[PDB]
Ligand binder design. Structure first.
Ligand SMILES: [Mg+2]
Ligand SMILES: [Mg+2]
Ligand SMILES: [Mg+2]
Ligand SMILES: [Mg+2]
Ligand SMILES: [Mg+2]
Ligand SMILES: [Mg+2]
Ligand SMILES: [Mg+2]
Ligand SMILES: [Mg+2]
Ligand SMILES: [Mg+2]
Ligand SMILES: [Mg+2]
Ligand SMILES: [Mg+2]
Ligand SMILES: [Mg+2]
Ligand SMILES: [Mg+2]
Ligand SMILES: [Mg+2]
Ligand SMILES: [Mg+2]
Lengths: 252, 117, 68, 234
RNA sequence: AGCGCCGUUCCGAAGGGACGGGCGAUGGCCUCCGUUGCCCUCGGCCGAUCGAAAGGGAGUCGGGUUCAGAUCCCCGAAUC
RNA sequence: CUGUUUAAUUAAAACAAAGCAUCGCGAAGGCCCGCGGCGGGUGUUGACGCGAUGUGAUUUCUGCCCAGUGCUCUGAAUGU
RNA sequence: GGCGAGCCCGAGGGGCUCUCGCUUCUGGCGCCAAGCGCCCGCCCGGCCGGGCGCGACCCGCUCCGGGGACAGUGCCAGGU
């Protein structure tokens, strides 16, 4: 039969991200001497709106200790920062909201965001609007630290990776209903073409594993495993359960 | 010596000037587009004739490989007259039409009678 | 005088004196490019019995292909 | 005296800028620089076989200076003095018609194909084996062959210095076969020390493995953990 | 296998420029200047290049003229 | 609901839609492309995100069955 | 090295054992070395223009971190 809708995402023809009007990739500073053995003053000049992102972007300018040139970077704007606040960064930086510092310095229960998986990749985990991570279980030997992620997973990471202290601003973004198709169309036109959302039962048999027949019924068990080939994994992909929840996660 | 920069690039090596052992075409290629080959036809129609009286301007048909400066030099080196300006168009048959307006010291009727049109 | 010793040392290419040099050369050549000019043959006996002579005009290219 | 003040700069973190330091160990080196440097480091890390750890166990510079002072006067002829001797001897045998003007020419031999033949036929009195040959397989059979044929061999560092006594870029081998009358004592004095160093210790060299040295950062880490273990045990 | 394909900053020794100083030489009216070579010093490209007759893009307007031209040609007045 | 569609026999009760849910995935990853490379899309992205589904505003509810077919967890204690 | 602390022996002093650094009220500025000490051609013990070192410690064998004989890659076999 025909190639399904799910297989067209890998071509990158019309399903790419709408990437021009974005301001830039939100990263931390590439780690160096001033952030591993001290701290350095930085000034947030203005916060801006990266399109396709509900979290605000912050434009923090630094000073280069090696050449006379003011370098400008793009942080994720933490909650409560304001233009003109001296955003500090480094190892021995004092714990305040906005100051990015490694997790080995901060105590347990420190609510941070925009942390790193590996030390030095400039911010990977907990970057969406209104999310945070919980820092627990430090270790003197075997430099590791548990972090509770926004999904509830407790990941053991290194002790040298960095994290901006605070939560990501823009929290509560999913509180308002979109309330019409128009704001959803403008939201997805800002983000990417992720919206040919057509029901797989309503579409044809030759184009989807579910559709067709004189009645709009699935006809097949929608719980389809991970060993299934491409064009087959539709519906519930490797579903360990279904139906209404009972507890929160029940996963060790 | 101290390498103060973390980036290593090519050193400025010595490049030799091209001093060939033999020329490669035995001779300079002669100028095919000379003064006698730039300016071909003096146009003698009604509108081209009206530019002699009412404009102090000759009309010529030029090979398309020439420009305003070569037309000006060709007129000054063939007809012994000075040129104020040269306007060029491409006539849609394929050739170039050049309206050569002369200096006010010269007379287009006299130049036309000397060239025979 | 020597090329028979070079040949017989190359034959048993699983011994410890050869496999170290072979592993070092495989690392050295894997970290190189795909097609490039080796200025002199690394196997002089094999190159000479295939037809290399040490004179101007014979060029050794070291080349890397993918197995399978 | 009037104004002439001192203007110091504080080079700490978060203040006045850092000066231009050496930056030697932090420059992005090219591919071939990294190739040869990690090649030397890889020879230091891995275990080399006992047939190539013979190399880097080589001749000291006093005996090498004595060896070069002996080898400098047995130099092979270059093209200029070769043609000079050919023209001179040809003119003398044409005019004076000399039957045997030269009895025996004393000159050494070069090249691995020549030296291996000379040690197989026991013509070699002394063998000089270069260190810096990039295919080591060309050279590895020669120490054991000179040992089993009883000819003394000395491993020397630098094939370019051996090429410059033969008027060539690389020489790789030098065989002393014929000695003069006033040089036999000096050659015996060299051969006695060379047999003391290399030939008499061949069963000692063949058992010893070379290389197997970790990086100095890892050695300092293991030494720090060893001092911590000794502090715990004491 | 291969015509070739992928990729556009990635795994690259991917700048042929310059304020200036020194040394040497040539040339013009060798006083005075203009050139050439060598050495020192300085100098992230966000990577060759293409891609809009509606995007960005300095500066011409008034009158008259032909059967057909017009901010283009003539006169007059300006600007880059 | 406003919207969209069988251009050239259908304009709809059809599709979409906000809302309600479910599942996979903490990047050496989830879902995909490619004949090929640790090559690409999501990704200038990081669970308030991405991908895949059922139902279809608001109000009130989401009955009972894991026998079957799927999906998933778990153990070399254990048949093949 | 104490403008800093430490933990003891202990009369000055000793380092069994460690902590490092010289920027936290402010939407300011910060580069192309001040200073010191040697060595050069010029005024008779005077003037100009230069070079070197300390400022900015010495040495070393991965650029620095995180994995690592696993993951992957090539072939073969069995599932789906
Ligand atoms: Mg909700
Ligand atoms: Mg939906
Ligand atoms: Mg739908
Ligand atoms: Mg249908
Ligand atoms: Mg099907
Ligand atoms: Mg050659
Ligand atoms: Mg262009
Ligand atoms: Mg018209
Ligand atoms: Mg007009
Ligand atoms: Mg109709
Ligand atoms: Mg993925
Ligand atoms: Mg409803
Ligand atoms: Mg039910
Ligand atoms: Mg490493
Ligand atoms: Mg390990």
């Amino acid at each position: 039969g025909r190639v399904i809708r799910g297989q067209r995402k890998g071509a990158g023809s019309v399903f790419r991200a709408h990437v021009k009007h974005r301001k830039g990739a939100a990263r931390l500073r590439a780690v160096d001497f001033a952030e591993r053995h001290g701290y350095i003053k930085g000034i947030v000049k203005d916060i801006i709106h990266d399109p396709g992102r509900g979290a605000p972007l912050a434009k923090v300018v630094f000073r280069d200790p090696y050449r006379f040139k003011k370098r400008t970077e793009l942080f994720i704007a933490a909650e409560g920062i304001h233009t003109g606040q001296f955003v500090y960064c480094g190892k021995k930086a004092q714990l305040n909201i906005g100051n990015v510092l490694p997790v080995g310095t901060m105590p347990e229960g420190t609510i941070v965001c925009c942390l790193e998986e590996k030390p030095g990749d400039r911010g990977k985990l907990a970057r969406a609007s209104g999310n945070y991570a919980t820092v627990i279980s430090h270790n003197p030997e075997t430099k590791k630290t548990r972090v509770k992620l926004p999904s509830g997973s407790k990941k053991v990471i290194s002790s040298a990776n960095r994290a901006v202290v605070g939560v990501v601003a823009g929290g509560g973004r999913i509180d308002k209903p979109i309330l019409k198709a128009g704001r959803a169309y403008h939201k997805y036109k800002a983000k990417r073409n992720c919206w040919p959302r057509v029901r797989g039962v309503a579409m044809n048999p030759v184009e989807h594993p579910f559709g067709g027949g004189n009645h709009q019924h699935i006809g097949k068990p929608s719980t389809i495993r991970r060993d299934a080939p491409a064009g087959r994994k539709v519906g519930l992909i490797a579903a360990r359960r279904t139906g209404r929840l009972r507890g929160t996660k029940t996963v060790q | 010596k101290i390498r103060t920069s973390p980036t290593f690039r090519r050193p400025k090596t010595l490049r030799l000037r091209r001093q060939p052992k033999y020329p490669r075409k035995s001779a300079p290629r002669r100028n095919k587009l000379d003064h006698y080959a730039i300016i071909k036809f003096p146009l003698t129609t009604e509108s081209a004739m009206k530019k002699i009286e009412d404009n102090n301007t000759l009309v010529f048909i030029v090979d398309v490989k020439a420009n305003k400066h070569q037309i000006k030099q060709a007129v000054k080196k063939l007809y012994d007259i000075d040129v104020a300006k040269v306007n060029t168009l491409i006539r849609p048959d394929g050739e170039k039409k050049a309206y050569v307006r002369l200096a006010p010291d010269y007379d287009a009727l006299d130049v036309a009678n000397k060239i025979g049109i | 005088g020597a090329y028979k010793y070079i040949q017989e040392l190359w034959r048993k290419k699983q011994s410890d004196v050869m496999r170290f040099l072979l592993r070092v050369r495989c690392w050295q050549y894997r970290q190189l490019s795909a097609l490039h000019r080796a200025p002199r043959p690394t196997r002089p006996d094999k190159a000479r019995r295939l037809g290399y002579k040490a004179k101007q005009g014979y060029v050794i290219y070291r080349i890397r292909v993918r197995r399978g | 005296n009037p104004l002439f003040e001192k203007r110091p700069k504080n080079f700490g973190i978060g203040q006045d800028i850092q000066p231009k330091r050496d930056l030697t160990r932090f420059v992005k080196w090219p591919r071939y620089i990294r190739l040869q440097r990690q090649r030397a480091i890889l020879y230091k890390r891995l275990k080399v076989p006992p047939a190539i750890n013979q190399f880097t166990q080589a001749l000291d510079r006093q005996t090498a200076t004595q060896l070069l002072k002996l080898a400098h006067k047995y130099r092979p002829e270059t093209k200029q003095e070769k043609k000079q001797r050919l023209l001179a001897r040809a003119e003398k045998k044409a005019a004076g018609k000399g039957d045997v003007p030269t009895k025996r020419p004393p000159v050494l031999r070069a090249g691995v194909n020549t030296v291996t033949t000379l040690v197989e036929n026991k013509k070699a009195q002394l063998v000089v084996i270069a260190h810096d040959v990039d295919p080591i397989e060309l050279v590895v059979f020669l120490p054991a062959l000179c040992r089993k044929m009883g000819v003394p061999y000395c491993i020397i560092k630098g094939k370019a210095r051996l090429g410059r006594l033969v008027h060539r870029k690389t020489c790789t081998t030098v065989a002393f076969t014929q000695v003069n009358s006033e040089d036999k004592g000096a050659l015996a004095k060299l051969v006695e020390a060379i047999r003391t160093n290399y030939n008499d210790r061949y069963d000692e060299i063949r058992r010893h493995w070379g290389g197997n040295v970790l990086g100095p950062k890892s050695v300092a880490r293991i030494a720090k953990l060893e001092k911590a273990k000794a502090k715990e045990l004491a």
